[PDB]
Each structure stands twice: as structure tokens, then as C-alpha cells.
């Protein structure tokens, strides 16, 4: 009969597109703002405000995250040919997440939210599997081109200090054309990636695996393997052993077979491409992309960006657009806010904010575990063809049910 | 009065698989099939002795006789170079052979009703066609020791202007860099092989790439497939009510996880290498898989046992200790090659024998006679007792008796 909200501090918010934008606003309206006062720095990364500002709004939000150390980002449209038409864009703008990653740096850690009544697709997975994706280099910064006919492709290195160049033959095309590409990574980026992985394994108490293909790329993938091993021996091995965990290198194909027959419960450090791909595989194996969280941990050990690990759910948004009922899972988006607020509360020693962030995570899981859930989770239980309308809640019924349970939980603890 | 078997190129391998290989031939093959065997030793010592020329000679012999069957082989790491005092950390024979022959490697689980799958919805099989040529498996990678410029250059053979592209200006330290390529003609054969596999199985075909990122490199795989599809295969796909689609690799691994199986999955060399191990494990046992390289000439094939050489079991066999080594992938390398041998020769007896041996293998396991690894797939290893499985020679022996019965019953 006379309450006062939690003062949450400074957070950078990146508004997004299509179905995740709708969810994003329901989360703020029903779960966050009634309990938490925020110093929000909002940036509209919607497809048409980006285009409006020649994508300057993306870069500015990236700089804002550097300044305030905490960002929460909604899924955004990444333009392709179709999208330039649909929004009559000025150009095919770069992915906002590549731009944001490239400015911030670091490792992207992805993890499924587990509810005990939600069957996995992979039978053995009891505990979670946290993939740490090295968010820099390799294919994502590579230079590729078409080879139009017979000829020589070479890759050369010219030292900056003046000494003589070295020239590696890629291929003599003798029979026609094809394609070629060069790609690189940097030692300091690999070192930051190793440290974040060892640190993540130690804070979760779980073992750590790095996957490469160094049997084939002895120099390129060998560099990753060597940097991890030296940093582990010099800096982490005795800590790992003190907690009865361990670090091992694995070939990527051995690693995906090992992961598939494990029980989970390990950190999986992936090079850029493998982490991009394998984390969608892992996400689906747990049940639903809607349940996949993601946090960019920057090398300063202080800045994070939290987001859902899925897209804008265009398919559902099209149905929403023509008045048709939808059942879109908000948990990944919710945990973007709770992870961002948890981190804000850690930097600030804000006890009430940290208790709120965890209460909302608990509430989300408890609601599903009591049998109230969106359709994608119902399908995990029954199999899609066998789901009845009575087995699940639509988008708005589920937020309402969550909002109801969160008011109860928070008024209980006071 | 044996079955006429014809010419077959055999590549001998290493450690436990080398041992099982000899047992397969003496127990299951040679008692029923007379063969003109052309045998190349790809054991790690002989590759070292010949500076790996024997691997090149084997691949050439496959061009000549059209059928190869390859035993698993050691791919040396640094511990192996010490063990054998190798002249260099030789590269996998599979890479050299695939580079010489070109083609597509089709991988598919070997399914036993009593071996549980780990992925719940995979009720039908998933066939991966891995492009066998180029990309990371023919690349050149090096260490960048400090600041400097990495560039990549194309010099046309006809003497016109060369083109140079900045890969990276290293300004803050060193790192690594690599160059890699593929060929139009080899991609086309990749496409043809995939469209033909789909049509022959009556299943739909998906090609995965990452063309959102590698717009030129992966875009070429995409454009080649689409062009060949529209001009040469779309009509026949529609007549069988199947289709072809390009999918982004990320989308596709998720789609496959939640799918029911029953499709052809065309993969670039790297993805096919990685996802075929994921898929074999998902169907229940990483080792229960077929791996058959189908060459562009449409006539030549090389079946291989895809797993490792089982070093721990070999050491135990060296010390004269009981082992329980699964032979099924080596057996199916023999049956797949002989089956294709029988196809080129219109040899109905050889074709019958190859499928019999495959059938005996499945039936024997489904009846409850299996090696320790398979019993552990069923009970869980901590719960496996000695009486739940056969040792290496007992299993081979049960296979041999069941095969002898199947061939007699059939006449
Ligand atoms: N972070 C972002 O800003 C991203 C935005 N995009 C965009 O999103 C739109 C559509 O893309 P899409 O392919 O449709 O993916 P998405 O995940 O939205 O939906 C797929 C299907 O997954 C099921 N599903 C997903 N979520 C839910 C849910 N909550 N509830 C229930 N079912 C769900 C549902 O399944 P169904 O119910 O249909 O069976 C759905 O349809 C495109 O514009 C992309 O640019 C993709 C990912 C990242 C970035 C992009 C980048 O940086 O370039 C990325 O990671 C990458 O690099 O690729
Ligand atoms: N390929 C090459 O193969 C060699 C070793 O590769 P590695 O990665 O060590 O994999 P291995 O082939 O050595 O097998 C690894 C382990 O998995 C199990 N295993 C593998 N194949 C079988 C089988 N056919 N029957 C039963 N159990 C099996 C065994 O587990 P256990 O020992 O627990 O029975 C074995 O110890 C290397 O030189 C590599 O280059
Ligand atoms: O890659 C090798 O060295 C051969 C073993 C292997 O991984 C395979 O054949 O798939
Ligand atoms: Ca991805
Ligand atoms: Ca492999």
C-alpha cells in the first residue's frame, strides 16, 4: 500500500524487428518496468531506423555498450536481396550483430534453458552444454573470389619491418576456374578467447573442451591448440585440478560425436564457424530455439551484451500481422534481460536488482514446469502432429501467466 | 566352385583394424569369392618407407580397376612420429586418395533394430554426400610471425592482368593465415552426384552452405547446383514428387536434428566430415557407418572403413589379451565394394553374396550376438557383463557360421 521500485541503474537497450520486437515490448511492459526503474539508453536497431540513419544507430549503440558495460539486444533483421526490396533500403546493410561484435570483441556463450518436463531430442542430455564461440575472424573476415579461368592463386606474407616476403602456392588451376579465399586470425584475439573459456569453465565448475581440425590445418588450428595449452599450463591447470575439472583438446569431428552421446555438463570452446553452426545444432537438440540464451563476454572482463539466440521469428510475425493467433516463446528474450540485469547488479552490488533477475528466471522455468507453456514446448512433449490447442498458451496468455506468477513470487519474498 | 569376384584394389591398414581385416578376408570373403586382388600396403611403416608413394599408387590402381576397399589407417600426430620415428607427420591417406580420385563420399548409418538411436525422431536414415575435394583438406596454412601484409593473388594463365586482394594488415601482433580453393568442374560433379543419389533413393535433396558470409566461394556452390538442377534434373525430381533446396548450414543442422530423416544432405568437404560423425553417433554408434566414395566417371568407387584403428585394442591383442572389436564397418567396406564390382560385371552371384553378408551382419546383432561396444549401447557400459557380448574372434566366428547357413539356405 505504498511501494517503491528497484533502481536498476544504466543499461543499453537495442530495439529490434518483427515478432521479437512485439515480445520485447510485452516483456518490458509486464515483467520489467512494473518492478524496476532503469536509466535506459535506447537505440532503435529496427530495420528502418538503421536504414534511416545509414546504420549509424548500430555503431552508436555499440559505443554506448562500451560506456555503460551492459547491453540487452532484441533480434534484428539482417538485410538480404529480398529485404532490400521489402523495405526499399538504401543499401544491403551489414548484420548489426557482426558490427556490434566487431566493435566490442570477445566470446559468445550460448546455453539452453532446461525445464524438467520438456523432453530433449537427444536422449542423454541431462545437464546443459555451454558453447563459447570465438566471435572474431576466420570465415567472417575472409576474402573470397571467383577464379574465372586457368591460372595461379597464391597467398603471400610481406613482413612490415622490410625483410623479404614469403609466397605460398594455393593452386594451379589447369582445367577451368573455381573459387579461392584467404582468411586469418590474430594471436591476441585467440588469447582472450582462451582466457574467457578457462574462466567460464571455472565459474561453472565444469570441464572444458576446445575443438579444432589441427590434423589438417597444422599451423592455423595448431595455433589455437598451442595458445590454449600454454595458457592452461601456466595459468589455470592447478585451479582446474583443485575443482576436479580438466581441459582437453579435441578434433572437431570427434567432439561432435562425443557431445552427442554425452550427458552434457561441459564448456565447449568453438572457433568462430563451428560455434555458429554447432550452437544451432545444440539448441535444437535441447528442444527449442526459443529456449536458447546468448551473452557476448568482452575481453575487458566487465562488459557484456545479452540477447536471445534466435532470429526475429518472421513466420510467427506474418501470422500476427494478419490477426492470426500466435504462440511465440519469450523465454530466450526474457533471459536476455535477466542476464543483462544480473550483470548490472553484479557491477553495482545491487542486491535487489540481482534478486529480481533470478526471481524472474525461476518464475519462467516454474511456470513451464507446472504445465503452462507455448506451443513449441508442447510439441517437445507430445510431438508436433499430436499437439492439441488445449495443450499450450498463445503468446499473450503465456506472458499473462508469467506476469501473474512473477507478482506472486516477488510479493512473497517481501 | 567359388563366386567369380573380378578385380578389386585393396588398401591394407593399421593396428586392430588391420587384424580384423585379415580375419574378414579369410573367414567371410575368400571361402566364397575368388578375387583378383591388387593389394597396396598403406600401413604407416610402408607409407614412411615409400615417402607415401604407395598411397598414390593405390589411388592410380583404383582408376584402373574401378573398385577399391580401404582398411582404416593411422593419421600420424607427434606421438606417432616418435613411436615410428617417421620422416614427417604424414597426412591422412584418405585425403590424398580423395584428392587424386575426386568425387563424393556418401555416408550412412548401419541400422540395427535393437541398437537405440540417441535422436528420438530419426526413424528413417539420413544420407550425407560429402564433397570429397578441396577446401580445408587441400589448403595452405602458415603462422604470421608479426606485423605485415597478407595478400592473395590470382595470376591468369593466359597472361592478362593479375589481381591482388588484401587478406589482412596485421598491425598489432601476429597470428595465422590460410588460403584454400575449389574447382568449378569438381563442384559440378558434386552436384551431379547429389542429384543422382536423390533420384535413385526417391528422397529430397538439401545442399548446405554459408553463402551469407562467403558470398563468392559458397555462392558458387549454390549457383552451380541451381543451374544444373533447373536445366537437367528438376523435371525428373517433380515426376518422383521430390525436390531440391539450398539451405544455410546453421538452419540445416537444426532442421536435421528435429527431422524424421529420409533425405539426401549434400555437404561441403568440411561440413560433411563433421556432420557425418554427428549423424552416425545420433543413429546409435559412431562406428556403424558406411563410407563410399563415388567418382565423377560414374564407374569408379572406393569403399572405406571410416573409423580409427582402435589402438587400445591392438595393444591388448599384442599382449595376448582378449578384445571385443566391432568389425562391421570393415565388413561393409567389403560388401559395398563387391556390390559395385558385381554391378559393373552383371555378376548376379557376387551381388547376391554382398547383400547376404550385410544381412547376416544385421541379423546376427539383432539376434543378440554383438561386441562389447554394442552391448553397451543397449545396457549402458557400467552394466555390461562378460556374458552380454562376444570377443573379437567369437563374433567373427558367429558371423561365419550364420553366413554359411544363409548361403546354403538360399540354394
Ligand atoms: N540476433 C539477431 O538479431 C538475428 C536475427 N535473425 C533474423 O531473423 C529473421 C528470420 O530468420 P529465421 O531463419 O526465420 O530464424 P528465426 O530463429 O527468427 O526463426 C526460425 C524458426 O525457428 C523457430 N523459432 C525461433 N524462435 C522461436 C520462438 N521464440 N518461439 C518459437 N519458435 C521459434 C520458428 O520455427 P516454426 O514455428 O516456424 O517451426 C521460426 O520460424 C531473419 O531476418 C534473420 O536475419 C537471425 C538470427 C540472428 C543473427 C543474424 C545476423 O547477425 O546475421 C544470426 O544469428 C546469424 O548470423 O544468422
Ligand atoms: N584414424 C586413426 O585411427 C587411430 C586411432 O584413432 P582414435 O581416435 O584413437 O579412435 P580409436 O579407433 O583408437 O577407438 C577409440 C576408442 O573407441 C572405441 N572403439 C573404436 N572403434 C571400435 C571398434 N571397432 N570396436 C569397439 N570399440 C571401438 C574403443 O574404446 P575402448 O578402448 O573403451 O573399448 C577405442 O579405444 C589414429 O592413429 C587416427 O589417426
Ligand atoms: O581423417 C583421417 O585421418 C582418417 C580417419 C577419419 O577421420 C575418416 O575417415 O573420417
Ligand atoms: Ca548460427
Ligand atoms: Ca573425420
Short mmCIF file of N, CA, C and O in Angstrom, two decimals, chain B residues 215-298:
data_model
loop_
_atom_site.label_atom_id
_atom_site.label_comp_id
_atom_site.label_asym_id
_atom_site.label_seq_id
_atom_site.Cartn_x
_atom_site.Cartn_y
_atom_site.Cartn_z
N UNK B 215 30.08 -15.00 -49.82
CA UNK B 215 29.14 -14.74 -50.91
C UNK B 215 29.67 -15.26 -52.24
O UNK B 215 28.89 -15.66 -53.10
N UNK B 216 30.99 -15.26 -52.43
CA UNK B 216 31.56 -15.71 -53.69
C UNK B 216 31.89 -17.19 -53.64
O UNK B 216 31.56 -17.94 -54.57
N UNK B 217 32.58 -17.62 -52.59
CA UNK B 217 33.04 -19.00 -52.51
C UNK B 217 31.86 -19.95 -52.43
O UNK B 217 31.68 -20.82 -53.29
N UNK B 218 31.04 -19.79 -51.39
CA UNK B 218 29.85 -20.61 -51.20
C UNK B 218 28.76 -20.28 -52.20
O UNK B 218 27.96 -21.15 -52.54
N UNK B 219 28.69 -19.02 -52.64
CA UNK B 219 27.75 -18.65 -53.69
C UNK B 219 27.94 -19.43 -54.98
O UNK B 219 26.97 -19.72 -55.68
N UNK B 220 29.19 -19.80 -55.29
CA UNK B 220 29.46 -20.63 -56.46
C UNK B 220 28.88 -22.05 -56.32
O UNK B 220 28.39 -22.61 -57.30
N UNK B 221 29.04 -22.68 -55.15
CA UNK B 221 28.41 -23.98 -54.93
C UNK B 221 26.90 -23.87 -55.15
O UNK B 221 26.30 -24.67 -55.88
N UNK B 222 26.30 -22.83 -54.57
CA UNK B 222 24.87 -22.59 -54.69
C UNK B 222 24.44 -22.39 -56.14
O UNK B 222 23.48 -23.02 -56.60
N UNK B 223 25.13 -21.51 -56.87
CA UNK B 223 24.73 -21.23 -58.25
C UNK B 223 24.90 -22.45 -59.15
O UNK B 223 24.04 -22.74 -59.99
N UNK B 224 26.01 -23.18 -58.99
CA UNK B 224 26.23 -24.37 -59.81
C UNK B 224 25.11 -25.39 -59.61
O UNK B 224 24.49 -25.86 -60.57
N UNK B 225 24.78 -25.71 -58.35
CA UNK B 225 23.70 -26.65 -58.08
C UNK B 225 22.39 -26.19 -58.71
O UNK B 225 21.68 -26.98 -59.34
N UNK B 226 22.06 -24.90 -58.55
CA UNK B 226 20.76 -24.42 -59.02
C UNK B 226 20.68 -24.50 -60.54
O UNK B 226 19.66 -24.93 -61.10
N UNK B 227 21.76 -24.13 -61.20
CA UNK B 227 21.77 -24.15 -62.65
C UNK B 227 21.61 -25.58 -63.16
O UNK B 227 20.77 -25.85 -64.01
N UNK B 228 22.39 -26.51 -62.61
CA UNK B 228 22.31 -27.89 -63.05
C UNK B 228 20.95 -28.50 -62.72
O UNK B 228 20.37 -29.24 -63.51
N UNK B 229 20.41 -28.19 -61.54
CA UNK B 229 19.07 -28.62 -61.18
C UNK B 229 18.04 -28.15 -62.20
O UNK B 229 17.35 -28.97 -62.83
N UNK B 230 17.93 -26.83 -62.40
CA UNK B 230 16.93 -26.30 -63.32
C UNK B 230 17.10 -26.88 -64.72
O UNK B 230 16.11 -27.20 -65.39
N UNK B 231 18.32 -27.00 -65.20
CA UNK B 231 18.44 -27.39 -66.60
C UNK B 231 18.35 -28.90 -66.79
O UNK B 231 17.93 -29.35 -67.86
N UNK B 232 18.73 -29.71 -65.80
CA UNK B 232 18.96 -31.12 -66.06
C UNK B 232 18.19 -32.07 -65.16
O UNK B 232 18.03 -33.24 -65.54
N UNK B 233 17.71 -31.63 -64.00
CA UNK B 233 17.11 -32.58 -63.07
C UNK B 233 15.73 -32.20 -62.54
O UNK B 233 15.03 -33.09 -62.06
N UNK B 234 15.33 -30.93 -62.60
CA UNK B 234 14.07 -30.53 -61.97
C UNK B 234 12.90 -31.37 -62.47
O UNK B 234 12.06 -31.82 -61.68
N UNK B 235 12.83 -31.62 -63.78
CA UNK B 235 11.72 -32.38 -64.32
C UNK B 235 11.63 -33.76 -63.68
O UNK B 235 10.55 -34.22 -63.32
N UNK B 236 12.77 -34.43 -63.54
CA UNK B 236 12.75 -35.78 -63.01
C UNK B 236 12.46 -35.80 -61.52
O UNK B 236 11.83 -36.75 -61.03
N UNK B 237 12.91 -34.78 -60.78
CA UNK B 237 12.57 -34.67 -59.36
C UNK B 237 11.05 -34.54 -59.18
O UNK B 237 10.45 -35.22 -58.33
N UNK B 238 10.41 -33.70 -60.01
CA UNK B 238 8.97 -33.49 -59.91
C UNK B 238 8.19 -34.76 -60.24
O UNK B 238 7.18 -35.06 -59.59
N UNK B 239 8.65 -35.53 -61.23
CA UNK B 239 7.98 -36.79 -61.56
C UNK B 239 7.96 -37.75 -60.38
O UNK B 239 7.00 -38.51 -60.22
N UNK B 240 8.99 -37.73 -59.54
CA UNK B 240 9.05 -38.56 -58.34
C UNK B 240 8.58 -37.83 -57.09
O UNK B 240 8.71 -38.35 -55.98
N UNK B 241 8.02 -36.63 -57.24
CA UNK B 241 7.48 -35.88 -56.12
C UNK B 241 8.54 -35.66 -55.03
O UNK B 241 8.24 -35.66 -53.84
N UNK B 242 9.80 -35.44 -55.46
CA UNK B 242 10.87 -34.95 -54.58
C UNK B 242 11.32 -33.58 -55.08
O UNK B 242 10.92 -33.10 -56.14
N UNK B 243 12.17 -32.93 -54.28
CA UNK B 243 12.59 -31.57 -54.60
C UNK B 243 14.04 -31.38 -54.17
O UNK B 243 14.64 -32.24 -53.52
N UNK B 244 14.58 -30.21 -54.52
CA UNK B 244 15.93 -29.80 -54.16
C UNK B 244 15.88 -28.39 -53.59
O UNK B 244 15.22 -27.51 -54.15
N UNK B 245 16.64 -28.15 -52.52
CA UNK B 245 16.66 -26.84 -51.90
C UNK B 245 18.05 -26.56 -51.36
O UNK B 245 18.66 -27.45 -50.76
N UNK B 246 18.52 -25.33 -51.54
CA UNK B 246 19.68 -24.87 -50.81
C UNK B 246 19.25 -24.36 -49.43
O UNK B 246 18.25 -23.64 -49.31
N UNK B 247 20.00 -24.74 -48.41
CA UNK B 247 19.76 -24.29 -47.04
C UNK B 247 21.05 -23.75 -46.44
O UNK B 247 22.13 -24.28 -46.70
N UNK B 248 20.92 -22.72 -45.61
CA UNK B 248 22.07 -22.26 -44.83
C UNK B 248 22.47 -23.34 -43.83
O UNK B 248 21.61 -23.97 -43.20
N UNK B 249 23.78 -23.56 -43.68
CA UNK B 249 24.28 -24.65 -42.85
C UNK B 249 23.70 -24.58 -41.43
O UNK B 249 23.29 -25.61 -40.89
N UNK B 250 23.66 -23.38 -40.82
CA UNK B 250 23.07 -23.25 -39.48
C UNK B 250 21.63 -23.75 -39.45
O UNK B 250 21.23 -24.49 -38.55
N UNK B 251 20.82 -23.25 -40.38
CA UNK B 251 19.43 -23.67 -40.47
C UNK B 251 19.35 -25.18 -40.64
O UNK B 251 18.54 -25.85 -39.99
N UNK B 252 20.28 -25.75 -41.41
CA UNK B 252 20.15 -27.13 -41.83
C UNK B 252 20.47 -28.11 -40.70
O UNK B 252 19.81 -29.16 -40.58
N UNK B 253 21.46 -27.80 -39.84
CA UNK B 253 21.77 -28.72 -38.74
C UNK B 253 20.62 -28.73 -37.75
O UNK B 253 20.30 -29.77 -37.17
N UNK B 254 20.00 -27.57 -37.53
CA UNK B 254 18.80 -27.55 -36.70
C UNK B 254 17.66 -28.34 -37.36
O UNK B 254 17.10 -29.25 -36.75
N UNK B 255 17.34 -28.02 -38.62
CA UNK B 255 16.30 -28.75 -39.35
C UNK B 255 16.54 -30.26 -39.29
O UNK B 255 15.59 -31.03 -39.13
N UNK B 256 17.80 -30.70 -39.41
CA UNK B 256 18.04 -32.15 -39.43
C UNK B 256 17.83 -32.75 -38.05
O UNK B 256 17.27 -33.84 -37.92
N UNK B 257 18.27 -32.05 -37.00
CA UNK B 257 18.06 -32.50 -35.63
C UNK B 257 16.60 -32.84 -35.35
O UNK B 257 16.30 -33.87 -34.73
N UNK B 258 15.68 -31.96 -35.76
CA UNK B 258 14.27 -32.17 -35.44
C UNK B 258 13.53 -32.92 -36.53
O UNK B 258 12.33 -33.15 -36.40
N UNK B 259 14.20 -33.33 -37.60
CA UNK B 259 13.55 -34.01 -38.71
C UNK B 259 13.33 -35.48 -38.40
O UNK B 259 13.74 -36.02 -37.36
N UNK B 260 12.70 -36.17 -39.34
CA UNK B 260 12.49 -37.60 -39.22
C UNK B 260 13.46 -38.42 -40.07
O UNK B 260 13.36 -39.65 -40.09
N UNK B 261 14.42 -37.77 -40.75
CA UNK B 261 15.26 -38.49 -41.69
C UNK B 261 14.63 -38.56 -43.06
O UNK B 261 13.67 -37.85 -43.38
N UNK B 262 15.19 -39.43 -43.89
CA UNK B 262 14.68 -39.61 -45.24
C UNK B 262 15.04 -38.53 -46.24
O UNK B 262 14.17 -38.10 -47.01
N UNK B 263 16.29 -38.05 -46.24
CA UNK B 263 16.69 -37.08 -47.26
C UNK B 263 18.17 -37.23 -47.58
O UNK B 263 18.93 -37.89 -46.86
N UNK B 264 18.57 -36.64 -48.70
CA UNK B 264 19.97 -36.54 -49.07
C UNK B 264 20.48 -35.17 -48.65
O UNK B 264 19.84 -34.14 -48.94
N UNK B 265 21.63 -35.15 -47.97
CA UNK B 265 22.25 -33.94 -47.44
C UNK B 265 23.62 -33.74 -48.10
O UNK B 265 24.61 -34.36 -47.71
N UNK B 266 23.66 -32.86 -49.10
CA UNK B 266 24.91 -32.50 -49.78
C UNK B 266 25.69 -31.49 -48.94
O UNK B 266 25.19 -30.41 -48.62
N UNK B 267 26.91 -31.87 -48.57
CA UNK B 267 27.77 -31.08 -47.68
C UNK B 267 29.06 -30.77 -48.40
O UNK B 267 29.60 -31.61 -49.13
N UNK B 268 29.55 -29.54 -48.20
CA UNK B 268 30.94 -29.20 -48.47
C UNK B 268 31.86 -30.10 -47.67
O UNK B 268 31.49 -30.61 -46.60
N UNK B 269 33.08 -30.30 -48.19
CA UNK B 269 34.04 -31.23 -47.61
C UNK B 269 34.05 -31.15 -46.09
O UNK B 269 33.88 -32.16 -45.39
N UNK B 270 34.24 -29.95 -45.54
CA UNK B 270 34.37 -29.82 -44.08
C UNK B 270 33.07 -30.19 -43.37
O UNK B 270 33.07 -30.95 -42.40
N UNK B 271 31.95 -29.62 -43.80
CA UNK B 271 30.70 -29.92 -43.10
C UNK B 271 30.37 -31.41 -43.18
O UNK B 271 29.87 -31.99 -42.22
N UNK B 272 30.66 -32.04 -44.31
CA UNK B 272 30.33 -33.45 -44.46
C UNK B 272 31.18 -34.31 -43.56
O UNK B 272 30.71 -35.31 -43.00
N UNK B 273 32.44 -33.91 -43.38
CA UNK B 273 33.32 -34.58 -42.43
C UNK B 273 32.78 -34.49 -41.01
O UNK B 273 32.78 -35.48 -40.28
N UNK B 274 32.30 -33.31 -40.61
CA UNK B 274 31.90 -33.11 -39.21
C UNK B 274 30.49 -33.65 -38.96
O UNK B 274 30.25 -34.34 -37.97
N UNK B 275 29.54 -33.32 -39.84
CA UNK B 275 28.17 -33.73 -39.57
C UNK B 275 27.98 -35.23 -39.78
O UNK B 275 27.10 -35.82 -39.14
N UNK B 276 28.77 -35.89 -40.65
CA UNK B 276 28.60 -37.35 -40.76
C UNK B 276 28.96 -38.06 -39.44
O UNK B 276 28.29 -39.04 -39.07
N UNK B 277 29.95 -37.56 -38.70
CA UNK B 277 30.21 -38.12 -37.37
C UNK B 277 29.08 -37.80 -36.40
O UNK B 277 28.67 -38.67 -35.61
N UNK B 278 28.56 -36.58 -36.43
CA UNK B 278 27.37 -36.26 -35.63
C UNK B 278 26.23 -37.22 -35.95
O UNK B 278 25.56 -37.74 -35.04
N UNK B 279 25.98 -37.46 -37.24
CA UNK B 279 24.81 -38.23 -37.63
C UNK B 279 25.00 -39.71 -37.27
O UNK B 279 24.08 -40.35 -36.74
N UNK B 280 26.17 -40.28 -37.57
CA UNK B 280 26.42 -41.66 -37.19
C UNK B 280 26.21 -41.84 -35.69
O UNK B 280 25.53 -42.77 -35.25
N UNK B 281 26.76 -40.92 -34.89
CA UNK B 281 26.56 -41.05 -33.45
C UNK B 281 25.08 -40.95 -33.09
O UNK B 281 24.60 -41.66 -32.20
N UNK B 282 24.34 -40.05 -33.75
CA UNK B 282 22.93 -39.89 -33.46
C UNK B 282 22.10 -41.14 -33.72
O UNK B 282 21.14 -41.43 -33.00
N UNK B 283 22.45 -41.89 -34.77
CA UNK B 283 21.75 -43.14 -35.04
C UNK B 283 22.12 -44.25 -34.09
O UNK B 283 21.42 -45.26 -34.06
N UNK B 284 23.18 -44.10 -33.30
CA UNK B 284 23.36 -45.01 -32.17
C UNK B 284 24.80 -45.38 -31.86
O UNK B 284 25.17 -45.54 -30.69
N UNK B 285 25.62 -45.54 -32.89
CA UNK B 285 27.01 -45.92 -32.72
C UNK B 285 27.85 -45.23 -33.78
O UNK B 285 27.61 -45.40 -34.98
N UNK B 286 28.82 -44.44 -33.32
CA UNK B 286 29.73 -43.76 -34.23
C UNK B 286 30.38 -44.71 -35.22
O UNK B 286 30.61 -44.35 -36.38
N UNK B 287 30.67 -45.95 -34.81
CA UNK B 287 31.34 -46.87 -35.73
C UNK B 287 30.45 -47.55 -36.76
O UNK B 287 30.98 -48.12 -37.72
N UNK B 288 29.12 -47.55 -36.58
CA UNK B 288 28.21 -48.22 -37.51
C UNK B 288 27.82 -47.27 -38.65
O UNK B 288 26.76 -46.64 -38.65
N UNK B 289 28.70 -47.20 -39.64
CA UNK B 289 28.52 -46.25 -40.73
C UNK B 289 29.16 -46.80 -42.00
O UNK B 289 30.17 -47.51 -41.93
N UNK B 290 28.54 -46.54 -43.16
CA UNK B 290 29.16 -46.84 -44.44
C UNK B 290 29.77 -45.56 -45.00
O UNK B 290 29.25 -44.46 -44.78
N UNK B 291 30.88 -45.71 -45.72
CA UNK B 291 31.55 -44.56 -46.33
C UNK B 291 32.07 -44.97 -47.70
O UNK B 291 33.06 -45.71 -47.79
N UNK B 292 31.41 -44.50 -48.75
CA UNK B 292 31.68 -44.94 -50.12
C UNK B 292 31.92 -43.71 -50.99
O UNK B 292 31.02 -42.87 -51.15
N UNK B 293 33.12 -43.60 -51.54
CA UNK B 293 33.49 -42.50 -52.41
C UNK B 293 33.04 -42.87 -53.82
O UNK B 293 33.42 -43.93 -54.34
N UNK B 294 32.20 -42.02 -54.40
CA UNK B 294 31.65 -42.20 -55.74
C UNK B 294 32.30 -41.18 -56.67
O UNK B 294 32.11 -39.96 -56.50
N UNK B 295 33.04 -41.67 -57.68
CA UNK B 295 33.87 -40.82 -58.52
C UNK B 295 33.09 -40.23 -59.68
O UNK B 295 32.04 -40.74 -60.08
N UNK B 296 33.63 -39.14 -60.27
CA UNK B 296 32.88 -38.44 -61.33
C UNK B 296 32.66 -39.27 -62.57
O UNK B 296 31.66 -39.06 -63.26
N UNK B 297 33.56 -40.21 -62.89
CA UNK B 297 33.35 -41.01 -64.09
C UNK B 297 32.10 -41.86 -64.01
O UNK B 297 31.75 -42.50 -65.01
N UNK B 298 31.40 -41.88 -62.88
CA UNK B 298 30.24 -42.73 -62.73
C UNK B 298 30.52 -44.22 -62.73
O UNK B 298 29.58 -45.01 -62.63
#
